[PDB]
Design a binder for this molecule. Structure first.
Ligand SMILES: [Mg+2]
Ligand SMILES: [Mg+2]
Ligand SMILES: [Mg+2]
Ligand SMILES: [Mg+2]
Ligand SMILES: [Mg+2]
Ligand SMILES: [Mg+2]
Ligand SMILES: [Mg+2]
Ligand SMILES: [Mg+2]
Ligand SMILES: [Mg+2]
Ligand SMILES: [Mg+2]
Ligand SMILES: [Mg+2]
Length: 125
RNA sequence: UGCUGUAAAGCUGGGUCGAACGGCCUCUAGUGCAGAUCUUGGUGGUAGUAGCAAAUAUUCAAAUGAGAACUUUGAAGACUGA
């Protein structure tokens, strides 16, 4: 890891918690919703039903918010936004906003390279 | 295209697009939908399916026309039957 050393990052659940019957119906979106029905097999946690979000799956507080490279990602919209990462170049990486123009994005990439800040999306436009 | 969050969700690559939009501290509310034989609009399967069967009945040729069972004319065969 090129970042500040950390314990091995553990993700207790790596899949996506998908709402019940978002596979059965198009009108039911995958965005997680807790079943509230009286008879629900999922709300009652029958064997074979889907896993549900709960606080037990919470991430280790020491590896939380770190991408696989070990950085915390901070959203940057202009070159002056990189100033808050001057003393955190080994623990925070910059991500250039999607609505930044191709010109200002070139300026942000050039200044980030000058400052040693890592950029999570260094290619797009 | 991926990343972050247990999650509600946030951010991001590519494509499309064409004029506005967001983060943060607060304020406010007509603020979150799968259901209500919900409302309005739209769209399926059914399905090229049910069917297009009352009132006797049409046929040959020529003309016209891109195209004629169905139009026009001629010839015939019929019917309504005062
Ligand atoms: Mg019960
Ligand atoms: Mg315009
Ligand atoms: Mg504002
Ligand atoms: Mg309302
Ligand atoms: Mg609905
Ligand atoms: Mg409901
Ligand atoms: Mg209905
Ligand atoms: Mg309707
Ligand atoms: Mg038929
Ligand atoms: Mg019939
Ligand atoms: Mg007679």
């Amino acid at each position: 890891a090129t970042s500040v050393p950390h314990p091995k990052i553990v993700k207790k659940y790596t899949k996506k918690f998908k709402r019940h019957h978002s596979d059965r119906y198009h009108r039911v979106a995958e965005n997680w919703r807790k079943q509230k029905g009286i008879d629900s097999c999922v709300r009652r946690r029958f064997r074979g039903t889907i896993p549900q979000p709960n606080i037990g799956y919470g991430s280790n507080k020491k590896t939380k918010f770190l991408n696989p490279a070990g950085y915390k990602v901070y959203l940057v919209k202009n070159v002056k936004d990189l100033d808050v990462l001057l003393l955190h170049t080994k623990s925070y990486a910059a991500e250039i906003a999607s609505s930044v123009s191709s010109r200002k994005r070139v300026e942000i990439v050039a200044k980030a390279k000058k400052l040693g800040v890592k950029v999570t999306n260094p290619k797009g436009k």
